Amino acid sequence: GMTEYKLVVVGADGVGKSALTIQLIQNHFVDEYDPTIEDSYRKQVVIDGETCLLDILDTAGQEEYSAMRDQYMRTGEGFLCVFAINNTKSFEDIHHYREQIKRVKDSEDVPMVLVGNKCDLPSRTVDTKQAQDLARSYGIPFIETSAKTRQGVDDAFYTLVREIRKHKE
């Protein structure tokens, strides 16, 4: 009936990790840029008729983290790997997050969703096709999101829960 899920939101500086989480939890867009150290949020949601208690870890994008990172990558059940569609460097950084999660988990089969955030902006530098091809090579879903409009936000989190559910079964 009731199941807890530990979700981890990872990605480079300013991709919108906090804004995506705050949209899901508080139903509003944060226009401010306030760097995260580490925050966690709970949310009880119904996904495919099942009562899920989400425990979401919102991580720091700030580079030079071999600190606290391995522990949450070990504890986390599923990962949202976020890049911003107008930030090519954040997309190139996905390889590093994916590889480190796989290394810490000691598995090639880790519940994960590739998230292309800021899809409300007409300043795209990363094509949907290139990100779709990367997710296909990883064997993971790819979802374009906007923390501003809330487009794809529920889809990204719910898809990740569905991926965790499949892994356990």
Next chain:
Amino acid sequence: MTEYKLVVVGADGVGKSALTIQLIQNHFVDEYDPTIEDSYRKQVVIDGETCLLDILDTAGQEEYSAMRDQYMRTGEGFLCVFAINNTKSFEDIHHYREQIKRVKDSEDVPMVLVGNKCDLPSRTVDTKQAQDLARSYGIPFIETSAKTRQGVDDAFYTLVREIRKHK
């Protein structure tokens, strides 16, 4: 690429148009403008599949239901919408469900029960009562808000998944 014909039904002022406009245009319509009949196309990716949604936004008023049996036969899936602060709109769900089943000549019709206006603290219809009704119908129940966009994609995507299973 797959086309999906979706029909949004429900009583007067439940937010059928606002839910659709939020999905198609990513904005909330504050104004109340009664619908006669409108349709919208939207290309979306659902579970890796490119879907072309053809959404029919219907009238909540009886006066504009001349196409009702025809769109209930043509429609592949139905969003049956009530407003959580309108008990009469929840009681009206029985009529929409029964007419869809009658026109389709089947008890197995892709359908999602939608409890809209969940952003309002003026609820008159409990989540449990609506969950129990959806359970008795054997259909999913999703609470939505066209204002915040909470549950909107979940409601439309769930309906596409229900159609996909039926097919």
